[model samples]
Target: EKLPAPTGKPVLTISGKIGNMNVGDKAVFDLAMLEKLGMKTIETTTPWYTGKVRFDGIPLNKLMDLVGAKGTSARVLALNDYTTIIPIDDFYKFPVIMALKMNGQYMRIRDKGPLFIVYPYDSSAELQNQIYYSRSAWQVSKMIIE
Candidate 1:
């Protein structure tokens, strides 16, 4: 797939093992392209939150599908250099999202955007722990498949 021209700034970049690419070997995504990929709205209360909230963005699995991702895992990178490893299975087993909006508002870097790795914490007891919590990388900008 040909990546559309970047009109403004790019918010996300998918690299490492994509079958389709536009930025050399990586697929660069602006907000509009991501929206075209499909957005999912999810509601949940995170460990850092005091109340339930809603988030809207592309599902991690579907994002993987966009470039026909092929890998054993994904390395999530945050703006601050925080890195987390997410097993490939989690993408298929859980409704994980790369959130761009929270509570109906767009998130800036300070607010954990333009991308935030979010999981359905309330839907599964297994995700309510430090391990999964650590994987919730905010201010996410890149996902490197490996």
Candidate 2:
């Protein structure tokens, strides 16, 4: 599926104990609106799955700047309630992404598509370790800066 052009609006919604996010949702930095932000792509595999593939999306720092994230860490919440806190600096040091596509196709629920936070493990041996792997979140809906 093709993604529509960003509307340049920011939205924030609360759902029970968690936030329910959608495209154009307001991040502290509003990623969808950052025109000058740099982006990077990667091709790799994860411990949860097998085989090599491509991931395409914006860099995390770009997303952070768009939302004006001003914190030492980020709280990433997955759809299953799995949560992880990652240092804010790590996002700037690595090619992390708020991924938009996988293997040139749009992702869906069964495939853990829609939105995912991915790291390029194949490009860096250190990233293949468990700590980084566990921090990568799929079916991601919300991220809280703190």
Candidate 3:
């Protein structure tokens, strides 16, 4: 994918040791950026959400591929200053996604969006735990490859 031409208020950015498709060492994304990548909806239950919900977003690997990321791990950052490290292999291991929408609508910061790293928790019984739950980031604002 080409560098994104984002629209609306800039909400999310990816940086660190990544190929600069946009800026010096960073990439910015808005709603329009979501359209440039392959998107899908996952209807499943999450520990953090109510019953089954549909989440819409591109696969995390797609963004990593687009930027030619060459890192062993990524630091997923949220608006509240919370973060967790995820191995690059984990991204390739599963269809982990950076969610942009939930239940058919864009999510607000108050509701854990703009961006969320949503894992298919129900699919993997192993992921239905605290350690993996930590990887299921919400209110995600940025990602730094390290």
Number of the top-ranking candidate, with lDDT as the measure: 1
Best by TM-score: 1
Candidate 2 lDDT by residue in tens digits, 1-146:
22234455332211222132334444322335332356567789877679987887778876665555677788888767888887888898997887767888766756775567889998899898988977887777667777
Full-model lDDT for every candidate: 0.85, 0.66, 0.82
**Winner by lDDT between candidate 3 and candidate 2:** 3
* Model 2 steric clash pairs: 11-26, 28-67, 29-66, 29-67, 29-68, 30-67
Q: How many backbone clashes does candidate 2 have?
A: 6
Better of 1 and 3 by TM-score: 1
Model 3, 70-114: lDDT tens per residue?
Answer: 899999888888989999888899888888888888988787877
Q: After superposition, how far is residue 12 of candidate 1 from its true place, in Å?
A: 0.7
Better by lDDT, candidate 3 or 1: 1
- Cα deviation of 67 in candidate 3 (Å)? 1.2
